[PDB]
Design a protein around this nucleic acid. Structure first.
Ligand SMILES: [K+]
Ligand SMILES: [K+]
Ligand SMILES: [K+]
Ligand SMILES: [K+]
Ligand SMILES: [K+]
Ligand SMILES: [K+]
Ligand SMILES: [K+]
Ligand SMILES: [K+]
Ligand SMILES: [K+]
Ligand SMILES: [K+]
Ligand SMILES: [K+]
Ligand SMILES: [K+]
Ligand SMILES: [Mg+2]
Ligand SMILES: [Mg+2]
Length: 1328
RNA sequence: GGGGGCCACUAGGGACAGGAUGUUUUAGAGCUAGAAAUAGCAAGUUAAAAUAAGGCUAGUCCGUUAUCAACUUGAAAAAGUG
DNA sequence: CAATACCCATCCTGTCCCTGATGGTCCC
DNA sequence: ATGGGTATTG
């Protein structure tokens, strides 16, 4: 009794099948438990587990961090209130109490309902005086009078509660950067550097032009237009563009070779890098430009003169309010005069998108502008209002979405101003001025995380002392250093060879020395007289390092040949091997530090090694400039303040993969030399890192083995979670392992012969729009400016390719037409006959694919000559990738080995995740070791790609139609088992390539014809094969083409297939997040304990974690007479912990009495119930059901639907077409099969009748179209939740099962993971 | 085949610190002519508070991921059962 | 009860770690 | 997006 297992691992499914020697699927009687008359049941050993997608932790994390932010904002306000407590108690002893209960209805308010003052007169007077908070803010900033303390608190609290971003380090408002003066200083430094070519900037109103609410390039065009004989791409134009935020190219301005693209948003290097070529001579010039950027940016936020107020922000908000008032008055009068019938709809209808809906309804600024633009264009006198509308500056509010550009420094300026104003009248303000400022300014450093005390699995902070941390004691109670170190050390890897050693920083000098020597030691060179290529000696390698690697950032092969072999060795022709074009490794950190410290002798002295290694470490471990300075202070005596400042400014990111103790630490017992010592010099063997750690002559290997530790073993689940993959496929993996365990238990604990596994292949429009916007603005093209596109629009392949190609053909240097995209072609770079890649990375939009060249290869050489420059531009704009660029440019460098490789890649799985699944299964099956202490592989784990069984299905007409039912997962698993076992039986030599564990034309031919042994006749550029295919060596039979195909057909035709939808408790949010308005409904859920939703609104739509069958009695009528009931009670996710802590008390609180504690059945989502005539339902909620049956459509109809819908040789195409038309009656039959199914199980009379009418309406339609829509028809029959579908143009809405009463008398079915083991409970025997 | 260092390019996972809206109740005295329904007009831009109910471990912490047929013995974790 | 239509929080900045996919190079 | 909650109409 031998057998194999076939598995199909997917993101929502795991298919499984058991096969025997004859590729047959067994069938057993399985015991049935429960209280029904059935004691056993016949099961086929084939099925598929279904489950909802595994979810990512992203949403949970976002909610967690937002939670923390709300807590901490509340704490900011609490600090501020604690500061005011005593003096406010002297002014108004209940002010903060009125504030805390501002939400409460007056009935529930324990104080006066007017918050600020507590009487109606003063409150109305306040609001008349300061219609917005910014009015009071500006007053307190500018005025010299003593203010009411409550008014002060309100302004300061408004600044603290909404403080603004911190994306700008340092302080702000350096003389308030009025744009004219920075523009003038730019002109001045430009005229300083170019006295012969000066710019006349007189009469140019830079303030208006650069601060205008216009696009960057348009403001650039305006300013350039104000300068005759001066162009936008010149030096000054490029500087103004850089100040406006564009990406100008300074190459052409200074006749550069290096492309000097600069954007102020790598710039720190990109400027230094550039300055080198033209000197520091020009630095100040560019600097006078950078400042302007700041000013321009501030001109976006502060739209008022900054010399009339120290509150430019609040003044600009008041400008908004005043223009809103004026424009609203004018608009009201205009509409009164010209369109008097619309006035109401505009100013009274909250449902309409007029001013009413804009202020009181749900209309956004954008929706209101869209609603009122035609009304303004239709009337007269609205020209200025239309101008303000198109500038997005009409009837503006003050609390909006574009306020994210307001830095915290501005709010801080106004806060500090108010403090210095009123600290003269209150002493507690003066003595707590810096404290309040710190309340506004303090941020938890990202490298500290939560300030937990041992109850957060996310926390890592170390405390210098054990006491409550506040904004003013943070630097003292918290260890910024140890916390910033643990921030990274908990996420970095250790050296795999020496597990207890930390890896080196990636940009470590020692690490880069290692990499360069390791690459340089395998180089070989030949000259004319030499007999054989030779290695570089230790002396030669040191000479190359000193002369070349320590003088150029990158060392090319040309530099090696000329600057060394010619200069030193006196060789006119030298052939180099082991390195191509240039060296991969390089001593970049050496050159950074040589620029910064300018002491080459310091860098070359081995004595300073340690120090340098520390510095880089410090520069990499930390990112806070203050901390970097504090750490580098111990070397302050070695460098000037210039060098030390330049040194603290430089920072590195990322870490290496080896430890210092491996590179330059452990030494060989006899040589005393470390690894790096062998790299620098190793006789005439020049052994690299791998050889060094594998030669038994040396002790490196033995010490590596000894250093190895294993630690604690993960559980299966722990091991799977720590894998690298999408959590959905990990859910699939774990379910697969559980399935295999249960299947082995079914077979009497006998382990299978083989296990064949296949793994399915694997918001976004926002990323697409970002890709194109960046590529086109980096490109500098106005095709996006004239052709606007929305994010959704990029879900079209051809249009997305159009924008990625800048509207040009990719094989011809010509423009493409948008409206002609239907006439163009989308071609694969490397042909899909070789690389089955259908992504944008291997596809190209061209006018005609003929223009690619020959279709059997990579684009021809002529196209590459024509288009390499344009492709390089698309590559630098990141519109095409480097892999795409390399495949496009391969003709100047496709070989037969490449084709053999592509074909093998289509068949041999190499994804690491599938190998991990194979490793898990193999280590669970094969556990014993032989006499040589080598693993005994009883169970062979084979892995296959989907194309094998796909091609098998299409070649032998075992077609799949996914929409008919869920049987195709299990069928895929079965075919996988069969194909894999037969394949390794026929060619055992291929075990290496397909089983886990330890000429180009020949392999091309072989791997292309590997699957031909199944066929009877093969036509290959006609040969015929025997009926019985056997193994050549063993003589064992692998495939009988007369009998085994019939076996496969019978297995696919079997109607009983164990589909099991995984029952899962629901988790996540309590309910819909929308805070609904007050309503007289018990569906409303209180957002806080005392906030009765009928007064305050609240949530609805709670999510049921799982339902519960309650058999009890409830009071009835005014007499409270106990009446026995049996019903489904949905325990909501929020009620879950309370219900589980004590279920009797929970249920009695809900109203139930005398609950039978033993008849309480937990029913998760998708719980299975069987009713009459085999009709099945799954629990969707406590009050709704999903379809629970599969429609087992016969195989002839499945194949007919495949062929007819257009889901080879022209003669075979004709035979298939002829079979379609000869079996046309199948159509009606299929309908019949659906109807009898629906009437039996679905029970949607209206829908089935509408569908029958639709089918009888389109009987004259073409057969292909009718079949395509019959495919849609199965949405009515499909397992699971009902959904709407369309038969041609008729739309069928979903019939829901809005009542769960019937299942209380049906039979509940508990299934094991495979569905082979059942427990069935007659629920009709409960109640009375 | 499997594994490693490097280079180049991409696709995804995880954690932290922050920003702007939104929503909800209250506050921002609506007025007049009618008894009222209702008519006419005025006004509107702002704020406070909450933003998973809440928890104990009381931290400027934690509360939406992963995991879950049934049954026996189990406080549970977990084994066992056809 | 049955059918029907409607609703559903959104957007953004920064710092950092990790694997895996493809191509290439040098090795065990 | 899907698919369960909700109010409306009946
Ligand atoms: K009261
Ligand atoms: K000009
Ligand atoms: K609104
Ligand atoms: K190279
Ligand atoms: K860093
Ligand atoms: K010094
Ligand atoms: K879920
Ligand atoms: K879950
Ligand atoms: K490699
Ligand atoms: K916020
Ligand atoms: K009001
Ligand atoms: K289950
Ligand atoms: Mg809270
Ligand atoms: Mg708000």
């Amino acid at each position: 009794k031998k057998y194999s297992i076939g598995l199909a691992i997917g993101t929502n499914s795991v298919g499984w099948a058991v096969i025997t020697d004859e590729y047959k699927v067994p069938s057993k009687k399985f015991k049935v438990l429960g209280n029904t008359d059935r004691h056993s049941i016949k099961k086929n050993l084939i099925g598929a587990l279904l489950f909802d997608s595994g979810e990512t932790a992203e949403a949970t994390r976002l909610k967690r961090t937002a939670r923390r932010r709300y807590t901490r904002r509340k704490n900011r306000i609490c600090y501020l209130q604690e500061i005011f407590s005593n003096e406010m108690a002297k002014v108004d002893d209940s002010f903060f109490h009125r504030l805390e209960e501002s939400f409460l209805v007056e009935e529930d308010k324990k104080h006066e309902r007017h918050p600020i003052f507590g009487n109606i007169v003063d409150e109305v007077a306040y609001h008349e005086k300061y219609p917005t908070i910014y009015h009071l803010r500006k007053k307190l900033v500018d005025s010299t009078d003593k203010a009411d303390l409550r008014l002060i608190y309100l302004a300061l609290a408004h600044m603290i509660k909404f403080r603004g971003h911190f994306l700008i380090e340092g302080d702000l408002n350096p003389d308030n950067s009025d744009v004219d003066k920075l523009f003038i200083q730019l002109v001045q430094t430009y005229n300083q550097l170019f006295e012969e070519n000066p710019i006349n900037a007189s009469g140019v109103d830079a303030k208006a032009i650069l601060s205008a609410r216009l696009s960057k390039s348009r403001r650039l065009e305006n300013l350039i237009a104000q300068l005759p004989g001066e162009k936008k791409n010149g030096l000054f134009g490029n500087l103004i563009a850089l100040s406006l935020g564009l990406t100008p190219n300074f190459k052409s301005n200074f006749d550069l070779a290096e492309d000097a693209k600069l954007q102020l948003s790598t710039y720190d290097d990109d400027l230094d890098n550039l300055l080198a070529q033209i000197g520091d001579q020009y630095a100040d010039l560019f600097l006078a430009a950078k400042n302007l950027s700041d000013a321009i940016l501030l001109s976006d936020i502060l739209r008022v003169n900054t010399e009339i107020t120290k509150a430019p922000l609040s003044a600009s908000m008041i400008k908004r309010y005043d223009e809103h008032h004026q424009d609203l008055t004018l608009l009201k009068a205009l509409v009164r005069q010209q369109l008097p019938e619309k006035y109401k709809e505009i100013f009274f209808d909250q449902s309409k998108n007029g001013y009413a809906g804009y202020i009181d309804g749900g209309a956004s600024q954008e929706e209101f502008y869209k609603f009122i633009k035609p009304i303004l264009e239709k009337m007269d006198g609205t020209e200025e209002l239309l101008v303000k509308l198109n500038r997005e500056d009409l009837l503006r509010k003050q609390r909006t979405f574009d306020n994210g550009s307001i830095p915290h420094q501005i709010h801080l300026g106004e806060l500090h101003a108010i403090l210095r104003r009123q600290e003269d009248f209150y002493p507690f303000l003066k003595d707590n001025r810096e404290k309040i400022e710190k309340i506004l300014t303090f941020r938890i450093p990202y490298y500290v995380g939560p300030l937990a005390r041992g109850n957060s699995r996310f926390a890592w902070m170390t405390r210098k002392s054990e006491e409550t941390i506040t904004p003013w004691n943070f630097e003292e109670v918290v260890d910024k250093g140890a916390s910033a170190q643990s921030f990274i050390e908990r996420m970095t890897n250790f050296d795999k060879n020496l597990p207890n050693e930390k890896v080196l920083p990636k940009h470590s000098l020692l690490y880069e020395y290692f990499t360069v020597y390791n690459e340089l030691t395998k180089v070989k060179y030949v000259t004319e007289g030499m007999r054989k290529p030779a290695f570089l000696s230790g002396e030669q390698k040191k000479a190359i390092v000193d002369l070349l690697f320590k003088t150029n950032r990158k060392v090319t092969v040309k530099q090696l040949k000329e600057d060394y072999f010619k200069k030193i060795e006196c060789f006119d022709s030298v052939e180099i091997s082991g390195v191509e074009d240039r060296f991969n490794a390089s001593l970049g950190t050496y050159h950074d530090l040589l620029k910064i410290i300018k002491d080459k002798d310091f860098l070359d002295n081995e004595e300073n090694e340690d120090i340098l290694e520390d510095i880089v470490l410090t520069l990499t471990l930390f990112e806070d400039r203050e901390m970097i300075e504090e750490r580098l202070k111990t070397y302050a005596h070695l460098f000037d303040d210039k060098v030390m400042k330049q040194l603290k400014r430089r920072r590195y990111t990322g870490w290496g993969r080896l430890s210092r103790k491996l590179i330059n630490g452990i030494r060989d017992k006899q040589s005393g030399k470390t690894i790096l010592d062998f790299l620098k010099s190793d006789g005439f063997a020049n052994r690299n890192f791998m050889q060094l750690i594998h030669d038994d002559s040396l002790t490196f290997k033995e010490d590596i083995q000894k250093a190895q530790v294993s630690g604690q073993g993960d559980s299966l689940h722990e091991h799977i979670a720590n894998l690298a993959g999408s959590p959905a496929i990990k859910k699939g993996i774990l379910q697969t392992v559980k399935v295999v365990d249960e299947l082995v238990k079914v077979m009497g604990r006998h382990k299978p012969e083989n296990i064949v596994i296949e793994m399915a292949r694997e918001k976004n429009s926002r990323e697409r729009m970002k890709r194109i916007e960046e590529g086109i603005k980096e490109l500098g093209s106005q095709i996006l400016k004239e052709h606007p596109v929305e994010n959704t629009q990029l879900q079209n392949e051809k249009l997305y390719l159009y924008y990625l190609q800048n509207g040009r053909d990719m094989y011809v240097d010509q423009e493409l037409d948008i409206n002609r995209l239907s006439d163009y072609d989308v071609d694969a770079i490397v042909p899909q006959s070789f690389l089955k890649d259908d992504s944008i990375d291997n596809k190209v939009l061209t006018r005609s694919d003929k223009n690619r060249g020959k279709s059997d290869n990579v684009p021809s050489e002529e196209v590459v000559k024509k288009m390499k420059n344009y492709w390089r531009q698309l590559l630098n704009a990141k519109l095409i990738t480097q892999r795409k660029f390399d495949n496009l440019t391969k003709a100047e460098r496709l070989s037969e080995l490449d084709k053999a490789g592509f074909i093998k890649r289509q068949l041999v799985e190499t994804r690491q995740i599938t190998k991990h699944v194979a490793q898990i299964l193999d280590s669970r099956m094969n556990t014993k070791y032989d006499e040589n202490d080598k693993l005994i592989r009883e169970v062979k784990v084979i892995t296959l790609k989907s194309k094998l069984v796909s091609d098998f299905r299409k070649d032998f007409q075992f077609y799949k139609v996914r929409e008919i039912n869920n049987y195709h997962h299990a069928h895929d698993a079965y075919l996988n088992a069969v194909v894999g076992t037969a394949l390794i039986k026929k060619y055992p030599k291929l075990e290496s390539e397909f089983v886990y564990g330890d000429k180009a034309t020949a392999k091309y031919f072989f791997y292309s014809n590997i699957m031909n042994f199944f066929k009877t006749e093969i036509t290959l550029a006609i040969r015929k094969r025997p009926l019985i295919e056997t193994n050549g060596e063993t003589g064992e039979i692998v495939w009988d083409k007369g009998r085994d195909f019939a076996t496969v057909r019978k297995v696919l035709s079997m109607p009983q297939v164990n589909i099991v939808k995984k029952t899962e408790v629901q988790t996540g949010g309590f309910s819909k997040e929308s805070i609904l308005p007050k309503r007289n409904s018990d569906k409303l859920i209180a957002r806080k304990k005392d906030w009765d939703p009928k007064k305050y609104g609240g949530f609805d739509s709670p999510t049921v974690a799982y339902s519960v069958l309650v058999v009890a009695k409830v009071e009835k009528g005014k007499s409270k007479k106990l009446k026995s009931v049996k019903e489904l009670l949905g325990i909501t996710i929020m009620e879950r912990s309370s219900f589980e802590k004590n279920p009797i008390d929970f249920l009695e609180a809900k109203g139930y009495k005398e609950v039978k504690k033993d008849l309480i059945i937990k029913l998760p989502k998708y719980s299975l119930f069987e009713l009459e005539n085999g009709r099945k339902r799954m629990l969707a909620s406590a009050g709704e059901l999903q379809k629970g049956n599969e429609l087992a459509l016969p195989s002839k109809y499945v194949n007919f639907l495949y062929l007819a819908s257009h889901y080879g040789s022209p003669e075979d195409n004709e035979q298939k077409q002829l079979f379609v038309e000869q079996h046309k009656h199948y159509l009606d039959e299929i309908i019949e099969q659906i109807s009898e199914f629906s009437k039996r199980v679905i029970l949607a009379d209206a829908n089935l009748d509408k569908v029958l009418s639709a089918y009888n309406k389109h009987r004259d339609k073409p057969i292909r179209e009718q079949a395509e829509n019959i495919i849609h028809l199965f949405t009515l029959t499909n397992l699971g939740a009902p959904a709407a579908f369309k038969y041609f143009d008729t739309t069928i809405d979903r019939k829901r099962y809005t009542s769960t009463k019937e299942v209380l008398d049906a039979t509940l079915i508990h299934q094991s993971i495979t569905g082979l083991y059942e427990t069935r409970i007659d629920l009709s025997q409960l109640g009375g």
